[PDB]
């Protein structure tokens, strides 16, 4: 696995020792090369995981996420080139290094074989994120947003540390393979209930469960574009990956302990989609849409059926791509009008035609249009939940309807109508932004030809 | 309240200094080369060659192997009269039931 870790580390001295006219170019070149190399990790075996060594391993769950991170880093660089153009060279290098450290930490989380190493790195991801959100954010709310995010994550994760150490002491090991083979049923005692909670709430905070989701809108709104990109694409899927990894040792107590979280997510999807129906900030609308989409992944993980896990993996990948692209489009609009108000700039379908097509395709993917992987994941989760209980279909259908409603409402409000008269600074879209949207969309559409790659280890 | 610089004018359009901009930086040459690097290493390499590599990836999921084994097993079961799929994932003769 070091074939990906070592170049990621070498990115730092490269950027630090590169000329001020070549940081972005070199970073993009070698991040894209790293993604190309990490594409080799998709050759997963049917039954056994790829055990590179004692410390790192990868299965059909880790590989798609690793590829997504290695692919998203260049996209973040391209999106963050614009506003970080008048910054000094040292701060640009610092921002690039923060992004690289975040990517490295994400890789080592998705490849870790030890639960405690996974925890260490998955909590280490906070520091680069928090710095990015509180240092290069534009608003004055970036300070409160960073605190909310950091403290929600830590208050969720510290009991997870306690529980992991307790499990290490009792079972003797935290290795995923051993903890999977030497698995044992959990009794219905209060101690097991609280161990289950300690293991679950940490990831429930990460992928925002309805009620613990208040940090996501602040974090996604106040952070810069690249920060929002990671937070939406990978930092939310961290919780899902952790939950899918740890649910092995949390049975059969889950059957009875999942009801509160299942109900919370199945109602919060509707609540957050309705909130999206009545949002005035584009980034806030996208963040609440992300909450609504991750509610389905939470449900799928808490049901623990093979179709649910496949749908969860597919939805994670698809939602990461779609949310990142939506945030990039909103960033372009913001950099054009210097405001995040949705109703401020209207009739953009007549001034930026290709950007309108990008918005249309992104919204279609967001509302789970067949045969996109978004729909593949959503339909798999819906079938799994229907098998779990037939009543679930009502909430699932209502959520789908409201998602289509608010996505098309965003499309109509932004890229339709009469152009805003007074706004005169809307210049023709650059090649960089269009290339960013194309690099967001094309892998997403291509994955529908080979959906088996992102369907998880249970395919 | 303070001696501070007036707010800088909204980001100057890179089209002003060079109508061909491609976004990115301000120097036209580095703009052209950054655009070439991005397009090449994004579409021509990691997209095209990436999709071809992931499309012709060797079948280590053992799907064709599983299908061939299933065909052989079905042949054996039907030819010899065996009831296709048994009803026990493990032989009962090796289970010491309480």
């Amino acid at each position: 696995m070091l074939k990906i870790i070592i170049p990621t580390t070498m990115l730092l001295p490269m950027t630090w020792m590169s000329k001020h006219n070549m940081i972005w170019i070199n970073a993009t070149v070698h991040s894209l090369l790293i993604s190309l190399i990490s594409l080799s990790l998709l050759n997963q075996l049917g039954e056994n995981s790829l055990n590179f060594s004692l410390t790192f391993f990868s299965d059909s769950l880790s590989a798609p996420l690793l590829v997504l991170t290695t692919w998203l880093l260049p996209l973040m660089l391209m999106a963050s080139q614009s506003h970080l153009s008048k910054e000094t060279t040292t701060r640009k290098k610092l921002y690039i290094t923060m992004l690289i450290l975040l990517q490295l930490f994400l890789i080592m989380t998705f490849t870790a074989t030890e639960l405690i190493l996974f925890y260490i790195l998955f909590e280490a991801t906070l520091v680069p994120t928090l710095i990015i959100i509180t240092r290069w954010g534009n608003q004055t709310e970036r300070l409160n947003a960073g605190l909310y995010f950091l403290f929600y994550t830590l208050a969720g994760s510290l009991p997870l540390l306690v529980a992991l150490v307790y499990i290490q002491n009792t079972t003797g090991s935290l290795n995923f393979l051993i903890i999977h083979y030497w698995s044992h049923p959990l009794s219905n005692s209060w101690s097991n209930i609280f161990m289950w909670l300690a293991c679950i709430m940490a990831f429930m905070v990460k992928m925002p469960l309805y009620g613990l989701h208040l940090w996501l809108p602040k974090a996604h709104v106040e952070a810069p574009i690249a920060g929002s990109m990671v937070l939406a694409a990978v930092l939310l899927k961290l919780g899902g990956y952790g939950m899918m990894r740890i649910t092995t040792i949390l049975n059969p107590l889950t059957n009875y302990m999942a009801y509160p979280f299942l109900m919370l997510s199945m109602w919060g999807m509707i609540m957050t989609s309705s909130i999206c129906l009545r949002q005035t900030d584009l980034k806030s609308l996208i963040a609440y849409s992300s909450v609504s989409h991750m509610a389905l992944v939470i449900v799928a993980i808490m049901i623990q059926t093979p179709w649910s896990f496949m749908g969860a993996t597919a939805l994670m990948i698809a939602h990461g791509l779609t949310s990142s692209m939506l945030f990039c489009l909103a960033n372009t609009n913001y950099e054009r009008v210097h405001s995040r108000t949705m109703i401020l700039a209207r009739g953009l379908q007549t001034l930026l035609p290709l950007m309108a097509t990008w918005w249309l395709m992104a919204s279609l993917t967001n509302l789970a249009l067949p045969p996109s992987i978004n729909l593949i994941g959503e339909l798999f989760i819906i079938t799994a939940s229907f098998s779990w209980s037939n009543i679930t279909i009502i909430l699932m259908g209502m959520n789908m309807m409201i998602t289509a409603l608010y996505s098309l409402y965003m499309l109509i409000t932004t890229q339709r109508g009469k152009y805003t008269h007074h706004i005169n600074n809307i210049k023709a879209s650059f090649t960089r932004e269009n290339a960013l949207m194309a690099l967001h969309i094309l892998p997403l559409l291509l994955l529908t030809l080979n959906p088996k790659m992102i369907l998880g280890p249970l395919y | 309240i303070r001696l501070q610089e007036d707010p800088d004018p909204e980001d100057e359009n890179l089209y002003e200094k060079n109508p061909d901009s491609h976004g990115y930086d301000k120097d036209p040459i580095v703009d052209l080369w950054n655009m070439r690097v991005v397009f090449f290493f994004g579409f021509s390499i990691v997209l095209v060659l990436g999709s071809t590599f992931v499309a012709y990836l060797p079948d280590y999921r053992m799907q064709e192997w599983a299908r061939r084994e299933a065909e052989r097993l079905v042949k054996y079961r039907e030819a010899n009269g065996l009831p296709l799929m048994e009803s026990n994932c493990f032989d009962p003769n090796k289970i010491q039931l309480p």
């Binding site: 534009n138 004055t140 | 309240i1 303070r2 707010p7 800088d8």
Partner: peptide
């Protein structure tokens, strides 16, 4: 347009 970059009113809170 620029980052908020604390002013005197914010700084005098600390």
């Amino acid at each position: 347009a620029r980052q908020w970059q604390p002013d005197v009113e914010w700084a005098e809170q600390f």
